[PDB]
């Protein structure tokens, strides 16, 4: 019931966007992926409750508005991506919900809710 699959799906989504929209070597994309996985599992450790998936949902949520998510920012820094470049490469107004058994996202305040990952408990 551990948090890796949901977090790796989230991270794979953000990586894919860097790969697609950017010019980032796989070496860097791999550093970013592992580092973001570790960052987020540290971040979610005490805020993960498999039996009540919406509990802690707001805390775990990854937002990109006019400020970049601070964990994305610092991990991305680790591979030499500045926040302004992230802003350019990643969608505007992105919301990424990373909950037990379900990863989902929205591009834009009024975009569709897409499911990245769903699995049965």
CATH number at residue 37: 3.90.640.90
Beta strands in the chain (DSSP E): 62-64, 94-99, 102-107, 113-118
For residue 75, give its domain range: 1-121
Q: How many domains does the chain have?
A: 1
Q: Scan for tokens 């049965």, then name that residue.
A: 120
**CB 72, CB 104: distance < 8 Å:** no
Distance (Å, whole) CA 121 – CA 104: 17
Q: b/e per residue, 9-36, with b = 16+ CB within 10 A?
A: bbbbbbbeebbeebebeeebbebbbebb
Q: What resolution does the deposited structure have, in angstroms? A: 2.3
Structural biology method used: X-ray
Measure the CA–CA gap between 17 and 61, rounded to whole angstroms. Answer: 18
């Amino acid at each position: 019931t551990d948090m890796l699959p949901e977090i790796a799906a989230a991270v794979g989504f953000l990586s894919s966007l860097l790969r697609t929209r950017g010019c980032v070597s796989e070496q860097r994309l791999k550093v970013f992926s592992g580092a973001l996985q570790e960052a987020l599992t540290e971040h979610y450790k005490h805020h993960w409750f498999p039996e009540k998936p919406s509990k802690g949902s707001g805390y775990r949520c990854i937002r990109i508005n006019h400020k970049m998510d601070p964990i994305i920012s610092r991990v991305a820094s680790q591979i030499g991506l500045s926040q302004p470049q992230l802003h350019q490469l990643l969608p505007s107004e992105l919301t990424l919900w990373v909950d037990p058994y379900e990863v989902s996202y929205r591009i834009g305040e009024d975009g569709s809710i897409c499911v990245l990952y769903e699995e049965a408990p």
